[PDB]
RNA sequence: GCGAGGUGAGAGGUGCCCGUACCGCAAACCGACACAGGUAGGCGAGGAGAGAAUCCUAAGGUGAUCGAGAGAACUCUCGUU
RNA sequence: UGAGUAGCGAAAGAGGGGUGAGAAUCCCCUCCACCGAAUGCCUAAGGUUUCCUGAGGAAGGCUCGUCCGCUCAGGGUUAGUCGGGACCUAAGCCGAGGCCGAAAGGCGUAGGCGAUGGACAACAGGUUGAUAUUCCUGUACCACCUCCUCACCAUUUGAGCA
RNA sequence: GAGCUGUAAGCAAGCUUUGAUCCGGAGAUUUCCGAAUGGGGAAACCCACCACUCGUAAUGGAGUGGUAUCCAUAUCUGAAUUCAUAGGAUAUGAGAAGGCAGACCCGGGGAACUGAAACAUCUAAGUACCCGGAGGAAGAGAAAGCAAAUGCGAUUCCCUGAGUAGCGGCGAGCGAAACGGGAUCAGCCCAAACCAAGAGGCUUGCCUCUUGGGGUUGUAGGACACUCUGUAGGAGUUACAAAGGAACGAGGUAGAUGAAGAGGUCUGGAAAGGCCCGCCAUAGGAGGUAACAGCCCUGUAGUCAAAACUUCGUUCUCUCCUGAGUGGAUCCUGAGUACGGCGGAACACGUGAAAUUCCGUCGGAAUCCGGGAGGACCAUCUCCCAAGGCUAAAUACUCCCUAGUGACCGAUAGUGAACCAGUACCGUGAGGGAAAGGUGAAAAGCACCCCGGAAGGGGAGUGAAAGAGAUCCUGAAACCGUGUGCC
């Protein structure tokens, strides 16, 4: 598969960017994609070094505008330690 | 629709009967057209930020398509549609003399 | 890019650009999640750009077959 | 299941009668008897009815 | 059985998926209810005590989702005679 | 209609200060009171965002409401070692062929599935508004791997694996 | 052919005469679950093996494809056991599986309530229901028939016969058929004798089996012999053998063109209405448009149009192919069959005087000097030739698609559902199952001011109307109020 399939986009919060200063960057991943694959995708497009991966699954949340109720998409969010030495990543 | 974007029509019906003037815009799935100076609608339009004064705005509120007819090219007259091929092209033309609208 | 102007590259050079397309996508997407991107529109364009280069591709392995 | 491997006899369904003439139902069973017989070209124990093997056509094997 | 390379120690490295919020003797679970009911298991301090009894406390938790008066009959739950 | 009637679902609050259009009812403070083999702490099942932050007050809340398990936004769940799977099997269930049966099917062997059991490597401290044997700090352990290093044994009674 | 990026406003960013959006034909892509089929599983999840590929020193990771069972065919192994066979392995299969249209059809199994004014035979009813199999239809079908004539000539369906004949605790009820009139029409292929060739049992010139030929029936036909005669005119993929191609025509799936009034004037917010005048019409269907339009728009009548896929027909191509007579030496013409007893079922027909058809069980023919039927049975006569198969049409039905119709409904009606309805809600589950349409022609959806935290209101403005201001056309009654003439 593609490095790029398996990151969708980063998560761009107050939390994620206290995380950033840890060297740890966090992205939606694919739901199907293993922190194996995380780690290699981000080494391939970032050119980074990889610590670890930590991931985990968000459910979707129930949500209403209006009568109509629904489920927002289910979310695979992977945060990404980068070793020591190791270029940083441009968000 | 039988009239298009940039053509004079005189309006044949409404308050407006009598009056001519271009189509600034059409509106094929509602068979409408906005006729310049035709049917001015008062809008009250409170303080948005694209318009931060508000206040009440002269402008045109579009009209039925069947209530305009185009001119004919001769006479001035209305006319209804007819088409015709033209060096491969369809064109438009006044029923009533013969010549191309469009 | 159009399908005639797809179709004068050969399978190599096509799926070199489907490449460099995902990696435009990818960069586009990374720019609507900040906030950055302006020509929104684009994302569109590239998506089907793939799509188009794509098509080409399962044509020629189709006539191959 | 009880079926002439032969003829293809098997349990049809009908009636009890009373002498007062009450229907209740019931079946007959085929006479079939279990025996050693080619079938597919080697011996196989199988159903057939008593009535199929009375001329001595479905060979005993 | 399998076998030309093994065994032990070091050094370097690899280690996926699912769950993880919060309630959980409860207003979030089962009882149509923010319902005196029901809901497995672990831990469960002190004094006096045989004790997880009992009363008062510790850690910790809580003051209860209509109130203010009046202090009749009657009804209920109590105390005394 | 009954009728402004019955009811408002076990329980201790009081005052001061605050906020606000509005306060018995929200916040803070003080003292008082209640539970304490629980009314505490942890954790199943079950629930499924109810969690945290900011904003809100129509409805829901048996009163009120500035408040809330409610409404609107945005956020929050991090594991080689915890629990489950890439391990094991019990009851039972499924069941290649097979046996049986008007049909549908019933039964059952091999073989599987199936925890409530067996087996199995990580601890202490710290940290956020919201997670923590999961993050961070320190110090570990388990299985597997070989670009490598060292020692030892051995190339057909020939190590070793099994 | 000029707009467009759906509901859906809105900003945003764009696209489009270098032809977008949009419509139709043919393709491509098509996660995961599901027959679900690599194995498992609490559907939409988990875990594999084998190739090849990416990646790593390597382990771990990733991608693509294959991997169910049964069946068929082929090949290779071949147990106990000698040969074998069972079994195992591998390969080739657009082979099967599952679904549904709550319909129609054919089978297997098969109620009861109910009726009989009770109830058991009987009825309901071979219904409902369950199960299997289908097919576009199915089933039936080319006389062992109907009948009783100077006969008919496959089947099916409609009318009629007829509520007759009959059946029936002769009760309740059940209830034909043929003739006659119509729709539609079409007939065929085997098995056997025999011939030829080959194969394996030699039973040893006999027998069995497999191919091809031959042959197809009733005042008998065929084999067999005779003499004829054809080997390419006739037939054909709807039976009668079975594939394929081209061409031409007419349809279907997008479309195109298309006559005549802004006539004047009057009310009006608006004119399609009134009044006074024209005009078109193979077009006065319909819908829309500010009130009711043949002449305003979309259209309509008529006439055209298809790159592509598709339906039908036709022609050619293609493919296939002797059919008449005369003789009776023998031979052949469907066997555990017909039929019978016993027990049931089906026939309108309830065991009866009970033919006829089918099932189980047991018994069991004749075979042309033969056999069956004509409502017990026998004789005579008449009609026919079973125990093999195929066969269109007329007939049934409608989840659908297209066009249209209604002395059908018009929001408690009509579908349960005009609206995001099999939803919400209820139930462990099967399952049950709602309520809820209307601003205006157009949002012109009330700028601004005032009271109020808001809600809400009073002005102002828009509009024909705001007492049309958002469950906003009309707005009854119950019910709730304010005022007060009389008591
Ligand atoms: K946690
Ligand atoms: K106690
Ligand atoms: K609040
Ligand atoms: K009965
Ligand atoms: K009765
Ligand atoms: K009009
Ligand atoms: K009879
Ligand atoms: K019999
Ligand atoms: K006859
Ligand atoms: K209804
Ligand atoms: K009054
Ligand atoms: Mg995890
Ligand atoms: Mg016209
Ligand atoms: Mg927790
Ligand atoms: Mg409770
Ligand atoms: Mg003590
Ligand atoms: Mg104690
Ligand atoms: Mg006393
Ligand atoms: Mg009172
Ligand atoms: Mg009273
Ligand atoms: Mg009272
Ligand atoms: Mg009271
Ligand atoms: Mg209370
Ligand atoms: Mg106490
Ligand atoms: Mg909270
Ligand atoms: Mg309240
Ligand atoms: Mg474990
Ligand atoms: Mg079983
Ligand atoms: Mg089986
Ligand atoms: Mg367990
Ligand atoms: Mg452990
Ligand atoms: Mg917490
Ligand atoms: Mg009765
Ligand atoms: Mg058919
Ligand atoms: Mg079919
Ligand atoms: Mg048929
Ligand atoms: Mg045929
Ligand atoms: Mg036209
Ligand atoms: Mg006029
Ligand atoms: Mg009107
Ligand atoms: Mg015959
Ligand atoms: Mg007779
Ligand atoms: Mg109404
Ligand atoms: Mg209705
Ligand atoms: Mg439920
Ligand atoms: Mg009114
Ligand atoms: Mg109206
Ligand atoms: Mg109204």
């Given at each position: 598969?593609?490095?790029?399939?398996?990151?969708?986009?980063?998560?761009?919060?107050?939390?994620?960017?206290?995380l950033?200063?840890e060297?740890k960057?966090t992205?939606?991943?694919?739901v199907?994609?293993?922190?194996?694959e995380?780690?290699?995708?981000?080494?391939?497009?970032?050119?980074?070094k990889?610590?670890?991966?930590?991931?985990?699954?968000?459910?979707?949340?129930?949500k209403?505008?209006?009568?109509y109720?629904?489920?927002?998409?289910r979310?695979r969010?992977?945060?990404?330690?980068?070793?020591?030495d190791?270029?940083?990543?441009?968000? | 629709m039988?009239?298009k974007?940039?053509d004079?029509?005189?309006?044949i019906?409404?308050?407006?009967?009598?009056?001519?003037?271009?189509?600034?815009?059409?509106?094929?799935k509602?068979?409408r057209?906005?006729?310049?100076?035709?049917?001015?609608?008062?809008?009250?339009?409170k303080?948005?930020?694209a318009?931060?004064?508000?206040?009440?705005?002269?402008?045109?509120?579009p009209?039925?398509?069947?209530?305009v007819?185009?001119?004919?090219?001769?006479?001035?007259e209305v006319?209804?549609?007819?088409?015709?091929?033209?060096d491969?092209?369809?064109?438009?033309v006044?029923?009533?003399?013969?010549?191309?609208?469009? | 890019?159009?399908?005639?102007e797809?179709?004068?590259?050969?399978?190599?050079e096509?799926?070199?650009?489907?490449?460099?397309l995902?990696?435009?996508?990818?960069?586009?997407?990374?720019q609507?999640?900040?906030?950055?991107?302006?020509?929104?529109?684009?994302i569109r364009?590239?998506?089907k750009?793939?799509?188009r280069?794509?098509?080409?591709?399962?044509?020629?392995?189709?006539?191959?077959? | 299941?009880?079926?002439?491997?032969?003829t293809?006899?098997?349990?049809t369904?009908?009636?009890?009668?009373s002498?007062?003439?009450?229907?209740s139902?019931?079946?007959?069973?085929?006479?079939?008897?279990?025996?050693r017989?080619?079938?597919?070209?080697?011996?196989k124990?199988?159903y057939?009815?008593?009535?199929?093997?009375?001329?001595?056509?479905?060979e005993?094997?």
């Open positions: 598969k593609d490095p790029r399939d398996v990151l969708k986009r980063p998560v761009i919060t107050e939390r994620s960017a206290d950033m200063t060297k960057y992205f939606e991943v694919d199907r994609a293993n922190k194996t995380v780690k290699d995708a981000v080494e391939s497009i970032f050119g980074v990889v610590d670890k991966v930590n991931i985990m699954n968000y459910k979707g949340k129930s209403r505008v209006g009568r109720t629904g489920m927002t998409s979310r969010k992977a945060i990404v330690k980068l070793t020591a190791s270029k940083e990543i441009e968000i | 039988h009239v974007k940039g004079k029509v005189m309006v019906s409404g308050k407006d009967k009598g009056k001519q003037g271009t189509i600034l815009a059409a509106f094929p509602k068979d057209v906005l006729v310049e100076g035709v049917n001015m609608v008062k809008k009250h339009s303080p948005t930020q318009n931060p004064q508000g206040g009440i705005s002269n402008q045109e509120a009209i039925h398509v069947s209530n007819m185009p001119l004919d090219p001769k006479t001035g006319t209804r549609v007819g088409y015709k091929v033209e491969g092209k369809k064109v438009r006044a029923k009533k003399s013969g010549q191309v609208l469009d | 890019m159009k399908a005639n797809i179709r004068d590259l050969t399978t190599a096509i799926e070199q650009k489907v490449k460099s995902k990696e435009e996508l990818f960069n586009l997407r990374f609507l999640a900040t906030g950055q991107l302006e020509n929104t529109a684009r364009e590239v998506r750009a793939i799509a280069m794509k098509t080409v591709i399962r044509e020629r392995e189709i006539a191959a077959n | 299941a009880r079926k002439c491997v032969i293809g006899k098997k349990t369904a009908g009636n009890n009668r002498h007062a003439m009450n229907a139902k019931r079946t007959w069973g085929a006479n079939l008897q279990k025996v017989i080619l079938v597919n070209g080697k011996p124990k199988v057939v009815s008593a009535r199929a093997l009375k001329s001595g056509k479905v005993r094997v």
